[PDB]
Fold DNA-7-methylguanine glycosylase.
Amino acid sequence: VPMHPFVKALQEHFTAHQNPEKAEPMARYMKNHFLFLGIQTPERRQLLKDIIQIHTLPDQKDFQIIIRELWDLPEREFQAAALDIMQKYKKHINETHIPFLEELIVTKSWWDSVDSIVPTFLGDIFLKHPELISAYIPKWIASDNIWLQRAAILFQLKYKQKMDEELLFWIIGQLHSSKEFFIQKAIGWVLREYAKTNPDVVWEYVQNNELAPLSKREAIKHIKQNY
DNA sequence: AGCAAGGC
DNA sequence: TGCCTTTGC
Ligand SMILES: COc1c(O)c2c(c3cc(C(=O)N4CCc5c4c(O)c(OC)c4[nH]c(C(=O)N6C[C@@H](Cn7cnc(N)c8ncnc7-8)c7c6cc(O)c6[nH]cc(C)c76)cc54)[nH]c13)CCN2C(N)=O
Ligand SMILES: [Ca+2]
Ligand SMILES: [Ca+2]
């Protein structure tokens, strides 16, 4: 049972606004891994602010506590709300939080949570602390947890000109032989995105290094006309 | 705004 | 394969 007053309040307010007809297609979209209340993102964020303005954003001492309690509730809107709350504490998230973010990645895992945790929060941490990459990324690749492997691929997604090209291509080479849908997809995604910045090096990489066909097609889909 | 980014 | 729905840029 949740015991933090903010979480109890958010649970009551969200639950009061559930829509079972809406919850069904929302849950099916996430392959029925999760129950849903049936609250889509615009309403969900207004209902969150309803609770924040009563209680005030909780002291930062509680932020992990609050996110963990929301992560433990069954309906997916509580994890989506938890991510919205993390965005409000961005300032206080730093390298000491990497293990916490790891736990979130591997608990109630799916693309909707992992893709929100990794490029923003881990991306920012490793930009400030790039000497720490080697303590996490190799371990994530070797874990055969597909969401930590996707995290290794995607933490640089939004780096643009900050991209560590040699590291990106090494990570991709370690994972190119994965059968996994979400790994083949992530490789295609990061290569297509980085090609917006550095197309020539993505072209050369894809022409000289093995990739699954889905990944290769995605990587080059907006630059192949130039070569 | 109106363009862009899983599901099937 | 490429269009759909919802969410993000
Ligand atoms: C080529 O360059 C670009 C441009 O060039 C250019 C623009 C852009 C903008 C981008 C660009 O990139 N954006 C934009 C859109 C987006 C990015 C992005 O980064 C992301 O990652 C950080 C994005 N993450 C998501 C995402 O989380 N989604 C989305 C949704 C799931 N969904 C639905 N329908 C689809 N078709 C999907 N496809 C993949 N997911 C899909 C969904 C979630 C999350 C959830 O919890 C969901 N719960 C239920 C649903 C349905 C659901 C969206 C997203 N790039 C651009 C704007 C103008 N412009 C111009 N003028 O030129
Ligand atoms: Ca392996
Ligand atoms: Ca797609």
Notes: The CA atoms of residues 70 and 147 of chain A lie 20 Å apart. The first helix of chain A runs from residue 5 to 16. Residues 1-227 of chain A form one domain.
